[PDB]
Design a protein around this ligand. Structure first.
Ligand SMILES: C[As](C)(=O)[O-]
Ligand SMILES: C[As](C)(=O)[O-]
Ligand SMILES: [Cl-]
Ligand SMILES: [K+]
Ligand SMILES: [Mg+2]
Ligand SMILES: [Mg+2]
Ligand SMILES: [Mg+2]
Lengths: 401, 402
DNA sequence: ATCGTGG
DNA sequence: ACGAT
DNA sequence: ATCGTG
DNA sequence: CCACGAT
């Protein structure tokens, strides 16, 4: 009987898109974003196109009636050529007029141009890309519907959160680890989440080589907890869970030792409670299968190894492996704490803000994968480096959606 | 709603021992064995034992009331010394009086003595061994109940069969493969089953080295099909399934190639239909897990690999069975239809176990070969009388290994 | 070797 | 070692 | 790059 | 890389 909390104290069942959208119309999102300009720019090269005009009308009406963001104006900016220089001029024109976000329509598939512009925008202002070639042969309403879930989130809104019991679960969950972007290079990440699935803070390392992995893992985690604790000084962390994921160097014994060391150092500096109870978990997507009745099903493979059959004639299953690699739990509370962390992981698999029907995979694993896609391709095609440190908007918003 | 067919047209639901025993009392087993002497021998070491006396009276009453084998006489033979020669003398005395089967009580868990005597009795007469030191007033009822399931079966009875749709599944299923008895030596096996779970014929190769595996795999399958077809001349086989199991040499591509050749040779010889539709399957027990609803669940891992979540009968244990289709001549149009049928068939066969009342929840085409392998390996280890069913219609057609 | 687990 | 109908 | 599964 | 679907 799990539900999403949306606006005005209302709650709606999970797994029901139609009831969610209707819920949003009646009660609004959990948090409407507070804008500075009440202005979005739409940037395209199809000035008097009838479909740009229908796009804009659906966006304008849905922002108001579904997302309850009232009195928004959409200004258009036209670029003459679909080249970086020409598009960047309109982007810069829009920014200097004062806009809260940019909706950027590209004409065709162009990976280098996309990653160059996306990395520029990430460093500048919340943004949402669109492809005009795909838009044409597409049902517009489903297009704009899902599009605005992530754009409103990038603007700082909170579409919905999970209703969870404040007596149960982790005070915070840190999704951490690293992801390879090629055979030698990787970056480390650390993301602090509330048990209701909301991202509180994120940090990423520079792109480094696998030999630098453990050094930057500890430093990225210390960075994220320092940043989180500076902005939530009165947040008491007495129960802490780490979700470690990502295709990363296979140094499991060394990694667990450095993670355990990090927690005790954070405990040294009173970043977490005096006797914080913690567990370090490895989360791994495994081979999908199809059942030829499983929602919330937990499978025990061994004393420290579990599997969650996450649902997405036939029932496709995306199983998630969960291994408890370390914990300071007593043996009396152990099984109870196991049930809580596996429940928590299942709850977090309901919390992705990429659209209304997102992939059901824990946000602690999926959001770092979205970050990896951007970082990998910006390094591959030469865009602007993305540096969250020092930039509160990047540290506190889901810029990666 | 799967059910077992027992006697007089009656059927009882699976997974309920109480109703199955009551069903047998009311209606009899699916087939009562046809005995030659109406006599069985009980051979033991404790003439004045109250437990032996209660054992003999429970066997007598339940053979009559549960299994509907009426008017059987149970003669007794006492051996003095608990050693091979003395016991074998009483076995030989009992065989010479004219008996249908021997029930043999041994003093304790003496493994060399057991396998030497059991290999002798397998080569002679249906038999059921018991341990004197394990009998107890508390367990005697359960003891005799299950003991008789396998003994009636070894006498040629059919306790129960699976109620299955005659239009679905395989005409015959051949359980085959090999089992290593040590790092070098193995034996091959081939068993023919009806889709209702009954075993029709079984053959095993001699113990051979792993280098001889593919040769003897082919010859053993041909022997069991020649045997089935000689004794079921009109059994049309239009749909054939092979269940390949056992800890055996790593030769998957060559093994598959030989198994296909074997089927093609049996078609040429008109042992199966020249247009037989068949599949070769690898059945593998994998690591159990526990769900923290799954009865008969089929899991697809790819177009060729499947998993059956068989229940092991807070935390509920699962004993999954990997099923890989390594070869088939199915049309793409009928493929997934056929996949559903062979996976359901494997589930149904996991409900067939004539070892006792409780289902083993492992397909009979895997489990009966594991039982044979236990005997063959230990009889070689402890130097018993070698067992080979060839030329012995009794070993070929009866589940001597239970 | 009543049969199966669980240890 | 236990429990099973 | 609406986001997903095949 | 495309085909089709979602409220
Ligand atoms: C910062 As750049 C677009 O020159 O890689
Ligand atoms: C058990 As022997 C040596 O009589 O074959
Ligand atoms: Cl007693
Ligand atoms: K005895
Ligand atoms: Mg996006
Ligand atoms: Mg022999
Ligand atoms: Mg037996």
């Amino acid at each position: 009987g799990l539900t999403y909390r949306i606006g005005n104290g209302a709650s709606v069942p999970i797994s029901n898109t139609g009831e969610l959208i209707k819920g949003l119309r009646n009660y609004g999102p959990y948090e409407v974003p507070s804008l500075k300009y009440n202005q979005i720019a739409l940037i395209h090269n199809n000035q008097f196109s009838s479909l740009i005009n229908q796009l804009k009308s659906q966006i304008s009406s849905k922002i108001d009636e579904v997302w309850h963001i009232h009195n928004i104006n959409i200004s258009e900016f036209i670029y003459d050529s679909p080249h970086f220089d020409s598009i960047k001029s309109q982007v810069d024109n829009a920014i200097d007029t004062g806009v809260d976000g940019i909706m950027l329509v590209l004409p065709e598939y162009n990976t280098p141009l996309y990653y160059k512009l996306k990395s520029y925008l990430i460093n500048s202002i919340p943004s949402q890309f669109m492809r005009y070639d795909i838009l044409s042969n597409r049902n517009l309403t489903f297009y704009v519907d899902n599009l605005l879930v992530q754009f409103v989130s990038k603007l700082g809104g909170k579409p919905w959160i999970l209703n969870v019991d404040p007596e149960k679960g982790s005070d915070i969950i840190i999704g951490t680890g690293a992801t390879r972007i090629d055979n030698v290079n990787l970056f480390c990440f650390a993301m602090v989440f509330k048990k209701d699935g909301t991202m509180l803070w994120n940090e990423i390392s520079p792109i480094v080589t696998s030999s630098e992995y453990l050094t930057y893992l500890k430093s990225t985690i210390k960075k994220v907890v320092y940043g989180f604790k500076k902005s939530n000084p009165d947040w008491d962390v007495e129960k802490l869970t780490l979700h470690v994921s990502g295709k990363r160097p296979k140094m499991k014994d060394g990694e667990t030792k450095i993670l355990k060391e990090t927690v005790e150092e954070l405990k040294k500096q009173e970043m977490v409670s005096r006797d914080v109870k913690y567990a370090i978990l490895h989360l791994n997507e495994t081979h999908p299968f199809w059942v030829m009745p499983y929602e919330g099903t937990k499978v025990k493979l061994s004393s420290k190894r579990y599997l969650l059959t996450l649902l997405q004639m036939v029932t496709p299953i995306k199983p998630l492996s969960v291994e408890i690699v370390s914990d300071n739990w007593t043996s009396e509370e152990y099984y109870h704490n196991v049930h809580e962390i596996l429940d928590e992981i299942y709850y977090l698999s309901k919390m992705n803000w990429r659209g209304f029907r997102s992939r059901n995979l824990p946000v602690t694993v999926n959001y770092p994968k979205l970050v990896a896609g951007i970082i990998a391709n910006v390094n591959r095609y030469g865009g602007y480096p993305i540096n969250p440190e020092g930039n509160r908007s990047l540290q506190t918003n889901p810029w990666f959606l």
